Every structure is written in C-alpha cells, then in structure tokens.
Amino acid sequence: VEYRGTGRRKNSVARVRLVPGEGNITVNNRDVREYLPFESLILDLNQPFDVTETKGNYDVLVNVHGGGFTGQAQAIRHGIARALLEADPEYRGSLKRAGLLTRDPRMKERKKPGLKAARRSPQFSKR
Amino acid sequence: RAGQFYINQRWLGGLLTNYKTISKRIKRISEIEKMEEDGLFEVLPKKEVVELKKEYDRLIKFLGGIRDMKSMPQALFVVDPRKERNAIAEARKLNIPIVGIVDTNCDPDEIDYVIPANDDAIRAVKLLTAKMADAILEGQQ
Amino acid sequence: IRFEIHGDNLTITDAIRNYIEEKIGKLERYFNDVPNAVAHVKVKTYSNSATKIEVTIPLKNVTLRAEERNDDLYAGIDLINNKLERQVRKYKTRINRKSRDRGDQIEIIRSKEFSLKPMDSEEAVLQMNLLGHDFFVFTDRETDGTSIVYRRKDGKYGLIQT
Amino acid sequence: MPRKGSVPKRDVLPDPIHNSKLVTKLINKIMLDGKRGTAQRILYSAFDLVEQRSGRDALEVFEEAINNIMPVLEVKARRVGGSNYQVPVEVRPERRTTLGLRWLVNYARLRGEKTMEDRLANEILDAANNTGGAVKKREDTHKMAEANKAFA
Amino acid sequence: IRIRLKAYDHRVIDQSAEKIVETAKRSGADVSGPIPLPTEKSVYTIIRAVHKYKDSREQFEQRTHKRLIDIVNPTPKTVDALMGLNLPSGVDIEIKL
Amino acid sequence: GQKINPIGLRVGIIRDWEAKWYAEKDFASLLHEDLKIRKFIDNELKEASVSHVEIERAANRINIAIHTGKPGMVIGKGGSEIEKLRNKLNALTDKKVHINVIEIKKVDLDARLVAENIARQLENRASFRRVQKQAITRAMKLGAKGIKTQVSGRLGGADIARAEQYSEGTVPLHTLRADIDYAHAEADTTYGKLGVKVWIYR
RNA sequence: CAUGGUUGUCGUCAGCUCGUGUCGUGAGAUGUUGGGUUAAGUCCCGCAACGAGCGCAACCCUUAAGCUUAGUUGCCAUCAUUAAGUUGGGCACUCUAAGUUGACUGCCGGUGACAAACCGGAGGAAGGUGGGGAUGACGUCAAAUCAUCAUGCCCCUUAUGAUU
C-alpha cells in the first residue's frame, strides 16, 4: 500500500507516499529532528492527519526538493493532504474546513525596476 | 387589434424627430434577433451573451411597438398631453395631426382633435380608446 | 535658508549674492517661525527676448513659486519678493483659523396624504395594483359612499364601506 | 483598504509547547529582523527561569503578568485645535492584547543583564508581582488619561 | 542521434517538429518524439530615456525554444528526412549522427 | 502623454517579424548586414512605393522580400531592374540569392505608404490640413475602419511648433487584438523637419 | 525658447470628445445631470435626449491547481554490483521541463426590493478587476536632450577641425 501524493508551497515541490505502519517521517532518507532545524513547526506540520486521527497508522518517508526549511515544511503537510484524500476520501471536508488542503497560495513578489527591491520605493529628500 | 404601432414605456426622446438615429436601431432589432437564431452564438463569451441579450430586451422595452414601423406616421393618438408632452411638441413641428384624451389639467390648444374624457380610470380609457382603435378598421375596407 | 543659485548661460556675480539674502532671505525669515528650508534661484538668459528669474521655496505643506520675465536682475527681484510675501500670507491665514470658538457638549407614524376620488371598484383594483398598496380608498361611483378595497391575509380582495 | 471599510484580520497559529496563541504572538514581537529560531529559543529559555523562581507553570504566570501591563484607558488625540486635544478613550480588546505585549518587550530590552535569557524573565516576574518598569508606565498612562478626565 | 531543434518562435519550432516526426515514421523508424528542453531566455534591461532618466526603463527579452529529436533505427529511408532540408526559415537543425 | 508606438506591443503577440532568421554564434556581425541592406534598399529605390522589407537567411541563400506598392518598378521591364538590383546586392554581401518581390493591393492603406505620400505633399508646401483630410477621407473609402494622423513641428511655416491631429473610426491602441500599423516620415520643408505620424486599422 | 524623434511629469488620474435631435434671439446648454453603486463616465434605474469614439474592464505575459501528447543529458517507489556511474533495464509512475482545459458575481440564500450592487454561504486548487507585469485618454510644465541620432539658422576652415 503506497498512497502517493504531492504538495507544493513557496517554490518547493514535495512528493510523499503512504506506507502503513506508524507515524514516522524520513525526509530525504534521514531523521526529521536532524533535518528540520528547531522542532517547533513539526507539530504544526502534523495538523493535516490530526483531523483524521491517523497518528499510529502511516509512515510517509518524503522526498522533498527545493526551497527552504519553512518551504520544505508547510509543503509536506500539504504533501500528505493530497495523499490523505486518497486514504480517507470521505474526510475531505475535515481538511477543507481546517487548513492544509488549500494550495500554494503565494510566493515572492517581482522586483520592479526603478525601485530598491520588491515594491519598496527608495528614499528621496525633498518632499 | 388595430394593427398599428404602440408605445408602452416612456417617450424615447426623438422617435418622431431624430428617427434617422432611431431607425438605425430599429435596423438593430431586425438584426440582433437574427444574430442568435442562426450561428455566431457558441463562440461568444457567456457574459457577452448577457449584454447582447440585455441590449435585446431593452430595445423591445421602449421600441417594442415600433418593431415593424419604418417610416413617419400620419396621425398620433395620445392618452394624456400632460405626461406625454414630449410627443406632442414633436407633433406640432412636423405638422402631424393630433387627437387625444384631455381633461382638467390638460391644454386643448396643442390638440387639434379634442376628446374630453376622464384620464385616471381604466374603463374611462378602455371603453374610449377601443372605439378609436376600432375607428380605423372599417376605414380599411 | 540656503540659496542654491545657478544661472543658465549667465555668470553669477557676488553683488547678487548679497542682494538676494536681504530681500528673498530676510523678509521670509520672520515668517515661518520654526525654519529649516532651502531656496532655489534660476536665472535663464534668452538672447532673443530677455532673462527670467524663478524662485522656489518648499516648506512643510505649501511651496512658494514666483516668476518674473524682466531683464533687470535687480528690479525683477523687487517683484519676486512681492509675490513671495503675498503667498506666505495666503499660507498662514489658511492655518491661522485655529481660533474657532467650539464648545464641546416615541413611535413616528409617517402620513401619506391622498385625495378621495370617485371610481368603479374595478378602477380601484387597477390603481391599487399600479402602486402595489394592499389598501386603496375611494368614493364608490354608483353608491356615493367611501369604500376601502384591501388585500386580505387570504390574498383575496375585501371591500369595506365606511 | 482603510477607507473602503475595515481590513480583514487574519488568523495565527498557536504554540506547540504551551498550546497558546498568546505565546506565538510574543514570539513574533521578540523576533528581531525575521530570525524565528534564534528568538524562539530565547523565549523557550525565558520561561524556565520563570518556572524556576516560581513553582507554577509559566502559561499561568504569563497571562497573570500581562494583566498588570494591559491598561484600560488610553489617549486618542482629536483635532479640536485650541482645546486639550487629548480624549481619554477605552481600549478595544484586540489593542488590549497587543499593547500589553508591546510594553513587556520594549522595557525588557533596557535592563542591566545583557542576555534576554534573563532580560525577559525578570520583567515577567516583576509584572507577575505588579512591579518593575513595564507595570509603572501603565500607571503613568493611568495618571495621564485619568488626570484629563474632562473628555469622557 | 539527437537532432537539435531550437528556434525563437514557438509556433515554428512546434510545426517543424511535426515535420521531422512525420517524415521519419513513414520510413523504418522508432522515433522517440519531441520532448521540450527548457527555454534559455535572456533579459536585456535598457533605459527608456533619450538623455537622462533612470527610474523609468523598458526591459527586453529574447527566448529560444529548444527541442530534440532522436531515432534509433537508422535506415537509408530515415536519413532521407535528414538529407532532405525542409523548413529552413527560422529554425536551425544541429544534425548529429 | 507618452504614447509608445503601437507596433512594439504587438511584435509576435498579434504580428510577425520583419526579419525571421537565426544565428547562435556570430549573432552580432550578420545582424549588421541586415541594416546594411535596409539602408541600401532605401537608398536607390527612393520611395518606389516601398512599405517594408523582410529578411530570411538559410544556408548562404539569404532571401529578401519587398512589398512595393507600385509593383514592376523594382522589377523593371520584364525582370530588368530586379536583375539590376542583384548586380549590387550580391556584392555588398556574399550570396544574396533568390531576391524576389511580391505585390500588395490597396496601395495606400499600408501605413508606410500613407505617411510617405503625404509627407511628399509638403515639399510643394500646399494646404497641410487638406493634406490631412486627403488621407482621412480616402481611408475608409478604400476599405479601412479607423484612421488617425498628425503633423508636429514648424506647422504651417510659423515659429512655435503645434501638433495637429484628425481622427475618426475605431482605433483601439490599447486592445492587443488590433492590427494597428503606424509610420513616421521625415518631411523637410527647408525651415526644419516636419514629422508626420499615421495610424491605420483594417 | 526655431525643430523631428524620444522620456519624465501631475497619475493609474477617470475623465475628454463627436454625430443627430431638442431648448435658448446666442455665447451655449443638454448627452456628461438626478437617485445609489463600483477600483473606474463601472453598471442599473429616473429624466429631450438617442447613440458613437477615446480612455476604464478584457484580449497579452507570468504566477496559482488540473488533463492529453511526447520522456532525454531530466526525474529512480519496485531489481541491485550505490564508489552514489543515479549506472543495467528503462522504471515514465510521481517530479520537472513544454504544447492546452478552466473563474464570472456562472451558480444560491438574504429581506433587499427587484435597481444594480453589496452581505453570508458553497461548489473547484483558486472568489469577487485572484497576485503581479505590460499597456499611461484629452492634456499641463516654451519640462529634459541641437553630446545617441537627425536638421532650420548662425558660426568656425594653418582650425572651434586634426594627430599623438
């Protein structure tokens, strides 16, 4: 059993799979606490399968790609959310109402020319 | 019943005098309903379908009784010269003869053919505007 | 209250550099009682017609522009300072209107008048519908009495004679 | 759009340790220059000294300390010109939450010790015991807005 | 064999990829079809003013659309499309053997 | 305002190229050979009703397509001047093979012609407002939809320059569907240069 | 400050005009105002105005989720001889990289009366011009460049041009 979902946020793609077992993540073939830096946002990263209560059910073992640590995280909780709707397909409203299953809503904004960087206009003296 | 041309909504403001731009749009109502009975309707955006139909009803709102009329009239029949004073002022510039229902709060000077009757009652209209509508039918044959 | 002076194709002297600050400078120093600003003086020669003088003094809210198209660069500033002194008084009396004496601190039934008129009951139904009103009161054409046609909670019509 | 109407305020994510929204909002205000981890570690080492110098767990102590910080009257200036132009106005509940967090951090940065290991926790136990520096400016607002009470 | 298909327009490099995939399958070929390589664009940022003004400029870019065609059944009928030069307008073909 | 030219929106969006070749290595030098023979074709033809040219290069057989509102004048007398052009065009570059020419109907609805033939109505110095109105009235008479044209500097012979535009018809400069074609000529009148823009549509 | 080109600027500011008709002895007026809506002279009502153009929205580009085609130098769950050759096979599946299907107040409920909107839902990944870019109306400033060019006039020609 391999329920393989994908997930994107902030220029960082994250594809997951779901092998049965218990809750244990193997991001880039290594431990999460030695890969994700400070362990705070991991309990916010466990929010999507919290509402389906499949804690001791699924090992995931993500292969992540690109971005940063808050771009790799917040993309595997969106990663397994596309995979949780092929594990519990009737539980789509439990993830739609609370968070995870929305999108990659927003990335960095374009630097316009004639300007310092990304909508921050430069200082002028004489008003 | 008379086979003549009616006006239900407000006077459009020039349909006897600036009707070289009103018949420009009576040409449109002879065209816009032809435009969607044939093709050239699936390729259009679904909201452009709306404004092409939002134009379509608003033509037959005001110009609905001038649907088949393509020339100037030769007589005009008004129910009230007070509320329809825009029409009577266009009548006297074109020397078109005029007949109308007048009462109190109506000037009979601009009406050539005067019908003194009540104006704020339905049977006072309907049992008086029907015979004048009937008046042309036995003038045909 | 500096003077970034610069002349388009005119060599600036030092007799101008004392005549500016006496008139453009000092007569606006006693205006703007908390001052920190920079002036700008252009002198643009035109060989076909004349010279011109542009004096711009920006401030916190409203700037101060004036122009003279004279050729005398000493008599023209006698008119620039005239236009400058007028514009400051416009600015100050705009903001000197702070002195304004400002001392800090049932069921209504709307009547709709109607004039009673004689008609058929069918006419009263017609006129009532043309307004969507649930009540229409009239004098009956044949009975002569005051009649109220109304729409019941039934949705049917009722007729009251008063 | 602050003149079309009001801006739609957005949701935050509560802390994992204390299970509190109020802790994460304290993380974001002590987050100088976008550094999330290097500021969150300091707060996670600025309530252990709270729980060392008092036996109670700090999630009780935090919401007890901020109640000596959060004022109930403040001053909004109305442009009346020659009047006092200082109207004593009560505080909306959203600004009631925020402005207590502001005073708690802004005077934690002006103590004798250098580490915010114990710059923060000293002012919390002062605010837990209704004393210190972030408490005493609440009383300064309650000696300013409560002195010009002629504009209720 | 890796027939390199790169060009400036995207409507032209796609219709010239349809030529070479058609004039090879008529012969004895086993064509792995056109897969699109990523476009190697390049942005040029000139300034708009004749004399003075920065802080108001026009950016320019030029995009090359890269594809490749490879065959692994070389017959003398397959190379009739290779020797047969077609669509020489705005596409170059770097024929490798 | 600062209206940019209407072709520049649409090059490749709703139009195509006046040069459709490719060269990865040595892109620079053989791009200069284009505007060598964009100056050179504009030298000896000298308003032979030429609207614009196209260049395509392939395997040292480099093509040149000219439109020539007066066709045959570049051809000559049965292929005379077209062969008399390749006697110099094949010397300024190496090959210049397969020089040809196509024809266009509606000789003065292409905007390059419309700007040019009324700019040459300014060296004789006669009634610039009618020189405007000659172009507008003839435009939708011949089959156009929207027309717009102006003259900028030393207008009428005076000192102060004044723009003077005349317009009717749908000219959607901001709509990206529109096949707007403009041109700019350099009509001298021996008291400066008059500039003239045009705008045609359909 | 004689000009053509060309760019800032008020300013992304929502305005600027025309046909025909009417009113006024006419300069002109209406249209463009009034009622309330919108980012908008954006729509909907009411009115001697009816329509049209230039702007505004959109079409263009990019970003956000999908499908179909084609899978290498790209990407390796399942096979291992992982130095990782990411190699053998091709795994082509996902990913990525490129050719196209789709978001508009389409769809409901309000009491809100029909007058469009607004307000609150659900429906998709996306929701109210989605985010951003490109595009800058009539015009203002004798605004800025005769040093990118181009040329009216004036001036220079053992030099105000040259060469080191």
Residues of C in contact with A127 (CB under 8 A): 58
The answer to whether C86 touches C79, Cβ cutoff 8 Å, is no
- B94-102 — which CB contacts under 8 Å span 24+ positions? B94/B16, B94/B17, B96/B16, B96/B72, B99/B75, B99/B132, B101/B125, B101/B128, B101/B129
Per domain, the residue ranges of chain D are: 7-152
- D44-47 — which CB contacts under 8 Å span 24+ positions? D44/D17, D45/D117, D46/D116, D46/D117, D46/D118, D46/D119, D46/D120, D46/D121, D46/D124, D47/D121, D47/D124
How far is it, in rounded angstroms, from Cα A83 to Cα A88?
Answer: 9
The answer to whether D81 touches C101, Cβ cutoff 8 Å, is no
How far is it, in rounded angstroms, from Cα C107 to Cα E60?
Answer: 71
Those residues whose C-beta lies under 8 Å from the C-beta of residue F104, and which sit 6 or more positions away, are: F51, F67, F68, F69, F110
How far is it, in rounded angstroms, from Cα B123 to Cα C123?
Answer: 7
Helix H or strand E encompassing C94: helix C77-95
Nucleotide nearest to E14 (CA to C1'): G99
The answer to whether F196 touches F118, Cβ cutoff 8 Å, is yes
Q: Is C54 left (phi over 0), alpha (psi -120 to 50) or beta?
A: beta
Chain Cα centroid distance, residue A45: 7
Q: Residue length, chain C? A: 162
How far is it, in rounded angstroms, from Cα F188 to Cα F172?
Answer: 30
Tell me which amino acid residue C6 is: H
Taking C1' of G142 and every protein CA, the nearest residue is F160
How far is it, in rounded angstroms, from Cα E59 to Cα E49?
Answer: 13
Taking C1' of G124 and every protein CA, the nearest residue is A102
Per domain, the residue ranges of chain A are: 1-125
How far is it, in rounded angstroms, from Cα B15 to Cα B94?
Answer: 12
| Crossing angle of the two packed helices C121-129 and B122-134, in degrees rounded to 10 | 100
* Closest residue by Cα to residue F51 from F200, F169, F174: F200
* Closest residue by Cα to residue F169 from F142, F131, F193: F142
The answer to whether D86 touches D75, Cβ cutoff 8 Å, is yes
Distances in Å between the Cα of C66 and the Cα atoms of A12, C72, C84, C88, E31 are 59, 16, 7, 12, 79
The answer to whether E97 touches E12, Cβ cutoff 8 Å, is no
- How many Å is the maximal CA-CA distance in chain F? 55
Distances in Å between the Cα of B126 and the Cα atoms of B51, B79, B115, C40 are 36, 11, 14, 83
The sheet carrying F164-168 orders its strands as F164-168, F146-151, F193-201, F180-188
Cβ contact (<8 Å) for D37 and A37? yes
How far is it, in rounded angstroms, from Cα A39 to Cα D37?
Answer: 10
Those residues whose C-beta lies under 8 Å from the C-beta of residue B89, and which sit 6 or more positions away, are: B110
Residues 25-84 of D with CB under 8 A from A: 36-37, 40-41
Check contact C-D (3+ Cβ pairs < 8 Å).
yes
DSSP letter string over B18-73?
STTTTHHHHHHHHHHHHHHHSSSSSSS-TTHHHHHHHHHHHHHHHSSTTSS--S--
Q: CB-based contact (8 Å) between C35 and chain A?
A: no
Those residues whose C-beta lies under 8 Å from the C-beta of residue F16, and which sit 6 or more positions away, are: none
β-partners of residue C146 are C139
The answer to whether A84 touches A52, Cβ cutoff 8 Å, is yes
DSSP D88: E
How far is it, in rounded angstroms, from Cα D50 to Cα D46?
Answer: 7
DSSP letter string over E10-75?
HHHHHHHHHHHHHHHHTSS---EEEEEPPP--EEEEEE--SSS--SSEEEEEE--EEEEEE-S---
- The C-alpha angle D47, D50, D52, rounded to 5 degrees, equals 115
Taking C1' of G149 and every protein CA, the nearest residue is E50
Resolution for this model in angstroms, one decimal place? 2.9
> Residue B54 — φ and ψ, nearest 5°?
-70, -25
Q: Identify the residue whose tokens are 């309907």.
A: B126
DSSP letter string over C108-158?
----------EE-HHHHHHHHHTTT-SEEEEEETTT-SEEEEEE-TTSSEE
Those residues whose C-beta lies under 8 Å from the C-beta of residue E84, and which sit 6 or more positions away, are: E23
* Inter-chain CB pairs, A–E, below 8 Å: 8
> Residue E35 — φ and ψ, nearest 5°?
-105, 140
Chain F: residue whose CA lies nearest to E6: F22
How far is it, in rounded angstroms, from Cα C58 to Cα C37?
Answer: 7
Q: Which two tokens stand for residue F81?
A: 């001047």
How far is it, in rounded angstroms, from Cα E27 to Cα E80?
Answer: 9
Chain A: residue whose CA lies nearest to D36: A38
DSSP letter string over C17-48?
HHHHIIIIIGGGTSSSSS---EEEEEEEE-SS
How far is it, in rounded angstroms, from Cα D44 to Cα F74?
Answer: 86
Q: Is E85 left (phi over 0), alpha (psi -120 to 50) or beta?
A: beta
> Residue F148 — φ and ψ, nearest 5°?
-160, 130
The three-state secondary structure class of B116 is strand
Cα-trace Rg, chain B: 18
Q: F73-101: string of b/e by CB count within 10 Å (b at 16+)?
A: ebbeeeeebbeebeeebeeeeeebeebeb
**Cα dihedral value F117, F121, F127, F133, nearest 10:** -10
The answer to whether F40 touches F89, Cβ cutoff 8 Å, is yes
The answer to whether A6 touches A14, Cβ cutoff 8 Å, is yes
Chain A: residue whose CA lies nearest to C63: A127
CB-CB: which of A37, A44, A70 is closest to D16? A44
Tell me how crowded residue C93 is: count the other CB atoms within 10 A of its CB.
9
**Cα dihedral value F123, F124, F129, F130, nearest 10:** -130
| Residues of A within an 8 Å Cβ radius of C | 126-127
Those residues whose C-beta lies under 8 Å from the C-beta of residue A89, and which sit 6 or more positions away, are: none
β-partners of residue F53 are F66
CA distance D83 to chain C (A): 9
Q: Which two tokens stand for residue B111?
A: 């009406």
Per domain, the residue ranges of chain F are: 16-105, 106-202
Tell me how crowded residue C60 is: count the other CB atoms within 10 A of its CB.
11
Q: Identify the residue whose tokens are 């997951």.
A: A16
How far is it, in rounded angstroms, from Cα E54 to Cα F31?
Answer: 28
Q: Which two tokens stand for residue A63?
A: 């292969």
How far is it, in rounded angstroms, from Cα E25 to Cα E71?
Answer: 10
Distances in Å between the Cα of D74 and the Cα atoms of C94, D19, D31, D86 are 32, 31, 26, 9
Tell me which amino acid residue C32 is: N
Q: Return the half-sphere exposure (C-beta side, CA atoms, 13 A cut-off) of residue C17.
A: 9
DSSP D101: H
The answer to whether A62 touches A10, Cβ cutoff 8 Å, is no
